[PDB]
Design a protein around this ligand. Structure first.
Ligand SMILES: Cn1c(-c2ccc(N3CCNCC3)cc2)c(-c2ccc(CO)cc2)c2c(Cl)ccnc21
Length: 274
């Protein structure tokens, strides 16, 4: 009885993830996001202990919905004849990180450090729950502007984390690593670290470093904005051409550029005027 449990509001967006509407849980006036996907547009199917074929995204989301505030949590889902409907939390006010960077340009390094740190904590949480996101990027990251907390979204290209090689990929190509472009082979963690390198560059430069396949493959990073040497070093480390030359999450978070991060609420007070 989806329409009796939730009040539907404006359309907030549409895209490869489907169509997302603002919503309110009639029970307790909780703000929610109501996301619709057509069955014929689902790229990858998975399934639950009961038998029911569902979008892979529902499998992954249930594994990472633990009360952690770094992933947008799945509250409920419904199956319709031709679509699935997902009920997700919705911070208020909220802004997508892609739009935030569009509006403000290159971020101050103190702000980028806090944002990057929170993205790492959230990706580590996903991996600890057995989930590989495979589409880390600014469009798939929300800012809870009052609390200064970032939240990951869109597991529709994800997979169960495994230790063997992946030979399939359906995320964003300009965030994909060179070993995928050249060989159509990657391992989950080092591919995630590559995409975190692209993301960090995007935050401190205001745009992604590579647009074309041969730029990804060549792996030469040019900085068009003034960026500290420690940040440049971390970025180039994450964008190492050989997967085994890339840092681990532990190595990223111990890097000199990552030290003395602001807490999320401090971040909101200094930088989000909140
Ligand atoms: C998918 N999704 C979005 C979302 C909404 C819109 C977009 N796009 C895609 C391109 N950038 C502008 C619009 C991307 C994501 C949002 C989202 C909602 C509101 C706003 C800002 O009003 C931004 C993103 C969202 C929330 Cl809150 C929970 C769960 N999923 C969500």
């Amino acid at each position: 009885p989806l329409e009796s449990q939730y009040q539907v509001g404006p359309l907030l967006g549409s895209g490869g993830f489907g169509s997302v509407y603002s919503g309110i849980r009639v029970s307790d006036n909780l703000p929610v996001a109501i996301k619709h996907v057509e069955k014929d547009r689902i790229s990858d199917w998975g399934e639950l202990p009961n038998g029911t074929r569902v979008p892979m995204e529902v499998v992954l989301l249930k594994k990472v919905s633990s009360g952690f505030s770094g992933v947008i949590r799945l509250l409920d889902w419904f199956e319709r004849p031709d679509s699935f409907v997902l009920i997700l939390e919705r911070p208020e006010p909220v802004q997508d990180l892609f739009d935030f960077i569009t509006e403000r340009g290159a971020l101050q390094e103190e702000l980028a450090r806090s944002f990057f740190w929170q993205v790492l904590e959230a990706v580590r949480h996903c991996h600890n729950c057995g989930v590989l996101h495979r589409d880390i990027k600014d469009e798939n990251i929300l800012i809870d502007l009052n609390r200064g907390e970032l939240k990951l979204i869109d597991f529709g290209s994800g997979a169960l984390l495994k230790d063997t090689v992946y030979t399939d990929f359906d995320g964003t190509r300009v965030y994909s690593p060179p070993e995928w472009i050249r060989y159509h082979r990657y391992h989950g963690r080092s591919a995630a670290v590559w995409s975190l390198g692209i993301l960090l560059y995007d935050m401190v430069c205001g745009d992604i470093p590579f647009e074309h396949d041969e730029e990804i493959i060549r792996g030469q990073v040019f900085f068009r904005q003034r960026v500290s040497s420690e940040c440049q070093h971390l970025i180039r480390w994450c964008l190492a051409l050989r997967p085994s030359d890339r840092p681990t999450f532990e190595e990223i978070q111990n890097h000199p550029w990552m030290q003395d991060v602001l807490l999320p609420q401090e971040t909101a007070e200094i930088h989000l005027h909140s």
